[PDB]
Structure 1
Amino acid sequence: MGPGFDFAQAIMKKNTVIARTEKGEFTMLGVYDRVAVIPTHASVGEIIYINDVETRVLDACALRDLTDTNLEITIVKLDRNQKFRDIRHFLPRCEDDYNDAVLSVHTSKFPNMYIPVGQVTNYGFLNLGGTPTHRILMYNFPTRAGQCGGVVTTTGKVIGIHVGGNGAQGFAAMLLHSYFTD
C-alpha cells in the first residue's frame, strides 16, 4: 500500500521459503548462498521440508550471546540446489529502535500476509516461554495463538524475525550483520 510494504514484498518474493519441522510450518528468511534463519523453538533436525521438499540440513547453530544467553535465532545451511539473493547489506550493524515496521508472513495458513506494526522498541531482556532471551525487539500486537516466525522490516532494513507474543505485544529476535560474516 506504501513504500514500507514495497520493501517487505520485495524481501518476501525472493528471500523466503516455507520451512516445516516436527514443531510446525514457519516463515524462513534466506540471507545468502544456502544460509537461512528460523526461530530456535522450530527445533531444526538433520532433515527439514523446504516448500514441501525433503532437504538435508548441512549445519544448524542455535545462537547465544557471549553471556551464554539464548538469542532465539537458529542459522541453518540447507542442502539446496539454488542460492538465495544476498541481502546481508540490508541487515543492521547494531542494536537499535525503529519507526514504522512491517511484519510479513508466508505459510499454507497465512499466505501473502503483511502487518503494519508501527514503532519497534529495543526491549532487550525477555523471559520467552520460560527461557531468558536477549536482543528482543517489541511492537504492539493483538497477540495471535500461534508462532510460525515472521520477517520484520523497515524501508531498506531487515531487522528481525518474529519469535513470540503475550496477547497485546509481539516480540522479534534481532538480526545483526555480524551473525552472517562467512
Structure 2
Amino acid sequence: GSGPEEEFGMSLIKHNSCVITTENGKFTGLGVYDRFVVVPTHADPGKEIQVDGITTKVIDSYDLYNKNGIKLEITVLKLDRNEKFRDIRRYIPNNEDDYPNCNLALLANQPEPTIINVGDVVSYGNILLSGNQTARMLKYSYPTKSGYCGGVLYKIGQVLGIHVGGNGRDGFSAMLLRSYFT
C-alpha cells in the first residue's frame, strides 16, 4: 500500500489474529467476537492449546457445516481469554460471491505479519466422491504453502475466508458467512 488494504489487514492481524499451536503445528487463528476464535479443523485442537505461546483451555469446540451438511474445515473455539475480541462479524459477507483482487493475512509460521496479494478469487465446487450435496470454497491462483493455513482472506471492509488448503498452484479458503456466527 500502504495503503488502506494493507492497513486494514495489518489492523486485523494486530487486533484479531493469533498464533494457535497444537500437536499438529502452528496455525493463524481469527478472533471473531466474544471469546470465539476460528481455526482450521485440521489443527485438531485438544482440551488445551497454545495461543501466542500461552497454554489456554478451550471451553467449547464447534465444527462448521454448510447448507448441505458438508464440513467447512474450520472450527470455532471458545477460549479462556482475558478479554474479548472486537466483534468483526460485520465484515463477514452474508452470501457467497466471487471477489476481485483479494489479500491474504498471515501470522503463523512467518517471520512477521504478512499480507499477500492472491489475486482474483472465485467460488469453486468441492469435488465429491459420493453424492451430489454440493459445497463451495473460495479459490485463487497462487502457490500457497501449508504454513499459510489459518490465513485470513480479505479485502477492505470484508473478512471473506480462512485459508485451509492448496495444491502447489491454487489456494483454497473456507467460505465465511455471517450466519455461521450470529
Match of 1:97 in 2: 98
The one-letter code matched in structure 2 to 1:47 is E
Match of 2:68 in 1: 67
Q: Structure 1's 101 and 126: CA in aligned 2 closer, same or farther, altered over 3 A? A: farther
Match of 1:23 in 2: 24
1:15-67 superposed Cα distances (whole Å, 9 cap, x missing partner): 00110111001110000110010111111121110111111101111112243
For the 8 Å contact 2:152–2:161, the answer to whether it is kept is: yes
Q: Structure 1's 110 and 171: CA in aligned 2 closer, same or farther, altered over 3 A? A: farther
Q: Structure 1's 43 and 60: CA in aligned 2 closer, same or farther, altered over 3 A? A: same
Cα distance in 1 for partners of 2:46, 2:172 equals 24
Q: CA deviation at 1:163?
A: 0.2
**RMSD after superposition:** 1.7
The one-letter code matched in structure 2 to 1:11 is L
Match of 2:163 in 1: 162
Match of 2:4 in 1: 3
1:106-144 superposed Cα distances (whole Å, 9 cap, x missing partner): 1254421110111100113146xxxx9823000111232
Unpaired segments ≥5 residues, structure 2: none
For the 8 Å contact 1:36–1:77, the answer to whether it is kept is: yes
The one-letter code matched in structure 2 to 1:67 is N
Matches within 5 A, 1:27-38: 27-38=28-39
Unpaired segments ≥5 residues, structure 1: none
Cα distance in 1 for partners of 2:175, 2:25 equals 22
Match of 1:122 in 2: 123
| Structure with greater proportional strand content | 1
Match of 2:56 in 1: 55
Q: Structure 1's 119 and 50: CA in aligned 2 closer, same or farther, altered over 3 A? A: same
Cα distance in 1 for partners of 2:155, 2:123 equals 14
